[PDB]
Write an enzyme that holds these catalytic residues in place. Structure first.
Site, PDB file in Angstrom:
ATOM      1  N   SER A 134       0.864  -1.186   0.000  1.00  0.00           N
ATOM      2  CA  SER A 134       0.000   0.000   0.000  1.00  0.00           C
ATOM      3  C   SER A 134       0.903   1.239   0.000  1.00  0.00           C
ATOM      4  CB  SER A 134      -0.840   0.051   1.297  1.00  0.00           C
ATOM      5  OG  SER A 134      -1.857  -0.941   1.282  1.00  0.00           O
ATOM      6  N   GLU A 174      -4.637   6.453  -1.710  1.00  0.00           N
ATOM      7  CA  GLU A 174      -4.082   5.119  -1.783  1.00  0.00           C
ATOM      8  C   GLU A 174      -3.843   4.498  -3.161  1.00  0.00           C
ATOM      9  OE1 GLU A 174      -5.599   2.257   0.870  1.00  0.00           O
ATOM     10  OE2 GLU A 174      -4.056   0.779   0.338  1.00  0.00           O
TER      11      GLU A 174
END
Length: 205
Positions: A134, A174
């Site tokens: 991530s 993200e």
């Protein structure tokens, strides 16, 4: 190719607009979106088992396996359309048990003598991550107080997806990288504030 230019976003709104536009273009399936949402709710539930099994899907419990298959499928649709920098914040655990509890001084500053050992171990070497990675388009407040910041240089065409819209969290810009990603740690430096280590990572395409 890592000497070429990489777009580095600093403006939260330009970044959010670009990513929102990318996400729409992926045309992910309902099942892929569901799996990505599940990942964002509790990434460690998926990355932990991936790490334990060194990416061997046969060793995952069935539900996790199916989720990994859908996220992997989602990456057949998600690539970056340009060289870009992605940022990630990490805790000392990222450096391994030999360094987890020694890299920070009691006041939170980087233990310099220990940092030298960290560099020796990792600088100029490849690292393979079995979980998904991530990241964020921006070095934002989401990384406040993280003692390690990695800046990945990701080449045009590499699998990477702006997944912020289907995340259970907000304002994080993200971007997700595939599991079993390999990168070269080209550099490691202590930040001017003396409380962070900045890692320059070259993502293998």
């Amino acid at each position: 190719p890592y000497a070429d230019s990489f777009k580095e976003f600093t403006n939260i709104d330009e970044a959010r607009a670009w990513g929102d536009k990318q996400f729409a273009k992926y045309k992910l399936s309902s099942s892929e979106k569901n799996a990505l949402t599940i990942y964002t709710r509790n990434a460690a539930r998926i990355n932990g088992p991936l790490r334990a099994n060194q990416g061997n899907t046969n060793g995952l419990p069935a539900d996790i396996r199916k989720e990994v298959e859908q996220i992997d499928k989602s990456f057949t649709k998600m690539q970056t359309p340009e060289n870009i920098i992605l940022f990630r914040g990490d805790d000392p655990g990222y450096l391994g048990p030999d360094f987890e509890n020694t890299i920070l001084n009691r006041d939170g500053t980087i233990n310099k003598a220990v940092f030298e050992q960290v560099k020796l171990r990792f600088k100029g070497k490849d690292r393979k991550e079995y979980g998904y990675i991530s990241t964020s388009l921006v070095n934002g407040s989401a990384f406040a107080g993280r003692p390690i910041i990695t800046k990945f240089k990701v080449l045009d065409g590499s699998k990477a997806g702006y997944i912020e819209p289907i995340s259970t969290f907000k304002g994080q810009l993200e971007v997700l990288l595939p599991r079993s990603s390999t990168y070269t740690i080209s550099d490691m430096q202590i930040a001017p504030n003396n409380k962070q280590i900045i890692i320059t990572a070259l993502l293998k395409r």
